[PDB]
Every structure is written in structure tokens, then in C-alpha cells.
Amino acid sequence: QHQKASNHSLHNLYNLQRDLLTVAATVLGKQDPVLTSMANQMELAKVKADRPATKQEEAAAKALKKNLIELIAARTQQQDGLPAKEAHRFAAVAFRDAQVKQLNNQPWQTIKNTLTHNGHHYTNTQLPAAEMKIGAKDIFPSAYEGKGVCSWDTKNIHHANNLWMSTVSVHEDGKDKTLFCGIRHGVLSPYHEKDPLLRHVGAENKAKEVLTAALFSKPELLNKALAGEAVSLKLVSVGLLTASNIFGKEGTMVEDQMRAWQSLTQPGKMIHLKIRNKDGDLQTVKIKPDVAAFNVGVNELALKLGFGLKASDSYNAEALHQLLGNDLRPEARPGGWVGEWLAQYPDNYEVVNTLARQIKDIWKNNQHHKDGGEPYKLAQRLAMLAHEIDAVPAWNCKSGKDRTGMMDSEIKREIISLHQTHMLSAPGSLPDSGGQKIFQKVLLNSGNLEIQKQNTGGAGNKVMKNLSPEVLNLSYQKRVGDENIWQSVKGISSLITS
Amino acid sequence: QHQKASNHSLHNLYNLQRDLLTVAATVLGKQDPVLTSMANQMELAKVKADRPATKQEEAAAKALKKNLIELIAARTQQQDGLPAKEAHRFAAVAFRDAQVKQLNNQPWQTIKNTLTHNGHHYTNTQLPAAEMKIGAKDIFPSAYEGKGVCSWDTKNIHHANNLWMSTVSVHEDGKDKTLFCGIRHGVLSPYHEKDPLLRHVGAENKAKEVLTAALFSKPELLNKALAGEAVSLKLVSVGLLTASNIFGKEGTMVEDQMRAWQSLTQPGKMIHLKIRNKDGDLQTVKIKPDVAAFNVGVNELALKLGFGLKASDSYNAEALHQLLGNDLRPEARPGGWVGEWLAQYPDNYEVVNTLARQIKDIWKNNQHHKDGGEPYKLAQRLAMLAHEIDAVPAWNCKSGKDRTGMMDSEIKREIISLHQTHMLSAPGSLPDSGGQKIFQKVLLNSGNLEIQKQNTGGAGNKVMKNLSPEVLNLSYQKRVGDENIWQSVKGISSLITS
């Protein structure tokens, strides 16, 4: 039971069929002996020795979901005579609903991992939204009660989808110095809500929840706000959607998110938030928000053939003026939020100046429109700069686990590399040997794999594709200088067509 | 033997397998009894009654070519021990070479069709390059001898690929008044030649051949040139390639064609052509060419998601200045070649003015970047205008049968519609009921289907696709207001993966 496969180890599938069978049993009622039939064969395979993933095993696992849908449709027709099209449509909707319910009810817990390199110890922590608590209850108004929201729950109007707080720290002098802390979430718009009014309202509630989490990241601000004083908060939001409606309605997703941020940062408008204090009682606090909203796009659809570049740049221009001022020449002096931070003369000036210069360079040559060996060149630096000047960085994807996970790994790699008193790497450059070793360790020892499994049932990443015309690939083979590690990051991700 | 299928009639396939089997027999040597095995079953199916195209018949025909390649590889390995990869590569090259040879050696003959509408009789004629003759031999230097060049012969450096002269005329007063005459060919560059020097030379020879055909379209000019006098010739060339290298190397194809035209129209450079006179003797004539070269792109790759629009417009700007002058405002007066034609005060002024105005309108609003219901809006008008002002229109595709055939049909429909003393339709407008009837008759009664069969072995058109995301379709369902006719134009075209 231990001869692990080169790809798709038997135990990973072993878990996958059980989850799908449980959903089917829930919808039916744990009475069909047919379900017990392959369940018994599954229990037989439980004690079987681990094997390389034969094509039969992969095909059986891949087609299991479709077979279950067909079985449900047959049961539906027998119980109630319906046409095949109507039964199939109804069965698919019911099956998806049951899966979201089950995935939502499982416990959500913090994830901790340890990484060692060059005699240094780093810790990565992923704190789920259900664990952000002062006292004994989560701070959010609509309580989580130890449960969460999955990326597939696209009709929820009360909660942000996949909300985590990501932290990396290094152990020194018997203490833990925090090196980076950020907020990762899903997109801020409910997808399949039809009423535009409910769509806008749902986006508002989700955005407020992200703001609540960001406030929790700064305990001193949280204490001041709980003391009854209005608090100013600065947030930098980075979206990773391609912003074109041609293939998957990611365009309207973007305007929904941007509209939500605008409605919360209306000038002179003070925002009221509800927070569970240490006594478990809802309490109202007053926030003066300030959000710089970005969207970049890191897909092949945006980098190879190029979609929504013009649409996104209209948003990015405003955000840069908000962040760096009205003069974006690379040799000028920084303004905006960066200028205000530097006016205090902090001992941080070296890193801040370098990051601002590099960002202006990328913007000037439009280097973010291509992937000169590394596609997250602009997003990664925006997040790092935001943390330096004491803002709160937040980034999101469509579902908050694939592209979000990749950007999480990129940021952690750069922070760790910089912590060794180094400088920053140049834009659009492949990592060297030491950087590659850092990146390989990060990709496996970060909490992304557990987030993947928690949110889906299998570990993997959809960013790793290997398309058929070789000019359409994003070049992670070079950034991750290892075939086996690259195949390990992309786990069961190809078997989750859903 | 007559119960025709709704799609893929049995007789069409019936011909297809025989052609493929003949090629395989040629490479092997008509000795393998295995070939005789399914040949005998094929002869058994010869007398069988016609049937609807069952999925088994379509699948067997579709996979026959792959099976034949595998059989050749097996024979190769048995005769000479080679690895599977080497044998497979060699077998594919040999099979393609044999097919091109056989398709080249078949006779090429003129195609004539008759169309009737509203008490009028029209005739469509397709004259192949091997039939353009004065005396008893084709005018081209490297004689065709009644044979031709196929679209798959991509390494030929002596001949233009798929050269035809297309004519539509109406019968009146016991006479035949010519309404339109043009030249359709394949692309002017040899694809797979590796030496850049031979690539440029081959493009030169092909372009000279197109010029020779164009001269033959004007008997008075041909007679003057044969009398020893230098002759001025005006030609308008329209390319229909998308001009991007992302998917299929159609970009480099375009620069090769444009470079060839430039080398023939070098200022002050007089061109010498060889022509077989009425006595079968090569004779040299002197031409003063003048070519306006265009490229538009009419694919989904260019119209829906948009490729090479910027690349092509750099060429189109120069060509328009050559054709209409330096002022392209829609209300200005025409200049360039159009201005010179109008300065003679012809009785043709009404049509010419309308066409020039519409072209400027399309150019101003960039309407050719989308398909507002009809994608050939700019190409079709360029060809019609060229014929009006006594130039020679010529258009080409990658292979010269699919997109070329569709543009052929579009032009014929508009000419016939206009001949009834009407006006021209507005840009980007669907045809009305009468126009739809005209278009339906043209698409079937033009010679395109026979060109398809001659050049490939099966009738069809690759422009008719019906892609899976509905926003990626070119909207011919509306232009051709008939499902059955649309399915008839797209014949065996989907079974010619080659």
C-alpha cells in the first residue's frame, strides 16, 4: 500500500472516489445496492498495494463523476418520468449543490509548515477566515462556526468565497519576526446571481468581509477601532483575471469587483463595520478606507495571444496614480502613498526606492504584457511594495486557489531570497541556481497543497498545463528547474473537471 | 445505389477510398494481398445500395489514411529494421509525396456551369492554367502538358500552385456579354523550402506566372505585346491570410508574397516575360507592371479574437494610397487609379463613385475588423472596383480553394444582383430574400465544388466550421438562409485531415 505512483498516487484517488460516492449517497439516501457494489470494490482496493497510475485507474477515476450523473438521471426517470434532457439538467444541478454543501460542512483549520535553508528556519501559516477570532467567536458578523465557504459556492451573498490570511516569518533570537502578511480570497462577485441588484449587493457584502479581515491583520488598528475611534486603513488589491468575455465571463467579473471597491471608497463616505468583540457581542466600528485596485492577468489567454490588456490598463492607470503620484517617469521622485511613507524618513528607504523604480520601469516598457521568463513580474512587486509602506496587500483569482496559490508561492520565494540581506532581482529574469532551490522548497512546503485538497478534495494546480502548440506555454519548466517537482505541483488537478 | 445520405453520400466516400488505395498501391507496388483484401470488400460495397452515412462508415473513412500509414511503416520495418519513430516519419513523407504526384498527373479541364434567374441566363467558367493557350500549347514557359499543380505541392519552385481564370457572363441578344473576369491562385511562397535564397527565387517565378495569366485575360494587350511593343499592366492583388505566426506560419507567408510583388514593381524596372506564341516558340515581351497588394484576413482567428490586424494594415495603407490617392476622406474626390479612370469621363461613373465611397467608409470606421454579418465586405468591393476601372483583379488563399472559393461565390452573387440595373448593397448588411436565393444558387452552381474535388478528391469547404463556443462563428447560417444548402457546401471537407 506504499508503492507510490510516479504521478497520481493511489491514495490520492482513494480519497477522491470516497468523496464523490459520499455526495451520491447523500442525494440518493444510502439505499442503492449499486452504490454499495462499487463501494465494496473500493474497500477491496483499500487494502490493495499501491501501484503506478495505470491508464485504467486514471480513466476510471476521470469518468466516475459522469457515470454518477447518469445513474442519478436514471433513478430520476424511474421515480418520475421525465425527458432525458430535463432529467440530466436537474441531476447535474442537484449533484453540484450537494457537493458544495458537503465541502462547506467539513472543518476548516489553520495550516502550518516549516522550511529550512542555509541555517535559517522559516514558518508559513495559513489562517482561514473561520479562525480569525478574538475571544471565542470569529469576528465576522455572519458567524462561520468552524466551517467555511468553498470556491464552487457561487451563489453565496453573505460570505467571501475562499478567505485566508497568509504569513511568512523567520525564527531569530528565540523570537519570530514577521516578514510578510497578506490576504488571499476569491473574486468579489457572485457569478450566477441573475438580479443585477442582488449582484451588486452581494459584491458589497463580500468586499466588506475582506476589509474586516484586513483590519484584523493589524492588531493596533483593531484595538483603536474597538476603543471607539475612527481608523484609517490603506489596502492594495490585485486581481489576476484576464478581463475578456470571449471564453468564460471573466470580463463582467472584473467590473463587478471594481464597482464594489468604488462604492466603498466614495469620497467623504465613512464605512461602518460589525465586529464580534471579545465578549461575543456585535459592535460597530468606523473605517476610513482607501483602496488601490489593480488587475493584471497572468494566463496564456492574456500573455501569449493577449486579451483584455486594454481593458485592464484603464484601471491600472488610476491605481498607479493613487500609489505613486502623477509623475511616473522612472527617474522622478515617488509621490502618492509611497511619497507619504518616505517623508517619515524610515530605515526602510532602500528597499522602497528600488521597488518603486522597478515598477515604473515595467510600466514604461509594457513588460507585463509578455512573460519574459516570469509572468508575475508586476503583481508580485505590487504586493511586496504594499507591505513595505505599511498598507495591506490582498490578491484574488476566479476561485482563489490556482492563480492565487501560484502568486502566493512567488511572493514567498522573493521574500525569503531578500531576507538574506540581498537585493532584489531584476524584472523578467529567470532565477539562478540558489533561487531555484528556494523556489522548489517553497512550492512544496507552502500551505497551497492543503488549501487545494481542502477546497476541492485533491491536491494540484490548474496553472500547469503544457499546451500542444509549444509557443502557448507560460515557461514554468525553466523557473522550476525540475521535472519531478513540476509534475508534483500539478497533482490531481487534471482530474477535477467540474 | 441511389438512397443518398443526408450528409456524406456513399458515392463520395466510394471515390475517396479508391484514391487513397491507389496511392498506397503505388508506393507498395500493387503486390500486397492485404490491399486486395479491403479492395475486394470495397468492390463488394460498390454494388451495395446507397445508405445514410452511418457513424461506422464515416469513422472507417476518416481513419483509413492513418491505418494505411501504419501499414506502410510495418512493411518498412519488416523490409528494413528501423525504429518506430524513424519509420513513421519516413512513411508519412513518402505517402504525401506519392499523393501529390498522382493528383498532379490527372487531367485538368475547363469547368462550365449555367445558372438561370428571373428569365436571365448566366454562365460561369473556370479556365485552368493548363488551358490558357494560343495555338496548340499553353502560354507558360514551363509547359503544363495538360496537367496541373495541386495545393499540396508546397515545394514546387517553377509553377504557381492552383491557378484559374474565373468568368461570369450573361447571355443577351444572341451574344455573351462578360460581366466579370478575375484570377484566383494559391499563395506565392513555397512553404517548406529551407534556403531563403530559393524561397525568394521561387516566389519570383510564381508571381511572374500570375502576371502572365493576367496578361492573357486582355487579348488586346496580349496582341500589342506580341507585336513587340512595351505594355503597361495594372493589377490588384488581394490576400486572405491572417498574418500571424502563432498557429500556422501564415505570417511569413505574407511577407514572402509582399516581397515578391515589390521586387517585380521596382521603379523604372522593366519586366521581361516568356510566352509561347501561336507557333509554339518562346518569345520575350516587355511589361510595365503596377501592382496594388492587399491583405485582409477573413478567419475567426482574425475577426473574432483578432490576429495580425496591425500587421496587415501597414500594407493596406500603402495600397489604398496607390489606388485612391492621398486623401481618404469619404466625401473627397477620388484620386490615384480611380481618378485617372474617371478623368476619361466614362459612362461607368455611377458604379465607380459608389464603390469608392463605400470603401472609404469601411476604412474609416475599421468595419473590416469585425464581421457585421458579412466578413468579405472589404475584399469583395476591392475586386469589383478593380474590374470596373479596367485593372485585373486577383485573389489568393493559403491553398487557393477554401477561402478563395468563398470569395469567388461572394463576388459572383454581387455581380449578378447588380446586373439587374440595381444599386449596390450597403456594407455589413445581410442579404434580403431575393439576394439569399441568388446566393444559394451561386454557391452550388459555381465551379467551386469541382475545383474542390479536382484539387483534393472530395467536395467541400473548410470555411464552414460551427465551432463549440457560439461566439466564435462567422455567421454564414444567416447569409445562407438554408440549413440543407449550408450542409451541402460543407461536403466531405471534414474528412480531409491531411
UniProtKB/Swiss-Prot annotation, chains A, B:
Gene encoding it? sopB
Q: Where is this motif: CX5R motif?
A: 397-403
Q: In its keyword annotation, does this UniProt entry include Hydrolase?
A: yes
* Stored Gene3D superfamilies: Cell division control protein 42 homolog (1.20.58.450)
State the EC number(s): 3.1.3.-
User: Which GO terms label this protein's molecular function in UniProt?
Assistant: lipid phosphatase activity; molecular function activator activity
Say which enzyme class the record assigns.
Answer: hydrolase
Q: What InterPro entries does UniProt report for this protein, alphabetically? A: IpgD/SopB
Q: Name one GO biological process term.
A: symbiont-mediated perturbation of host vacuole organization
Keyword Secreted found:
yes
Q: Domain comment? A: Contains the consensus sequence Cys-X(5)-Arg characteristic of Mg-independent phosphatases.
Query: Per the record, what is one GO cellular component?
Result: cell periphery
Q: What is known to happen upon mutating residue 397 to S?
A: Loss of activity
Q: Which family does it belong to?
A: Belongs to the phosphatase IpgD/SopB family.
What's this protein's name? Inositol phosphate phosphatase SopB
Q: Where in the cell is it found?
A: Secreted
Q: Which UniProt keywords apply?
A: Hydrolase, Secreted, Virulence
Major place of residence: secreted
List each coiled-coil range.
Answer: none
Question: Which purpose does this protein serve, as stated in its record?
Answer: Converts phosphatidylinositol 3,4,5-trisphosphate (PtdIns 3,4,5-P3) to PtdIns 3-P and prevents the transition of PtdIns 3-P to PtdIns 3,5-P2. It is one of the known effectors injected by Salmonella into the host cell and is required for invasion and for an efficient generation and maintenance of Salmonella-containing vacuole (SVC). Alteration of the phosphoinositide composition of the plasma membrane causes membrane ruffling and actin cytoskeleton rearrangements.
Per the Swiss-Prot or TrEMBL record, the active site comprises 397
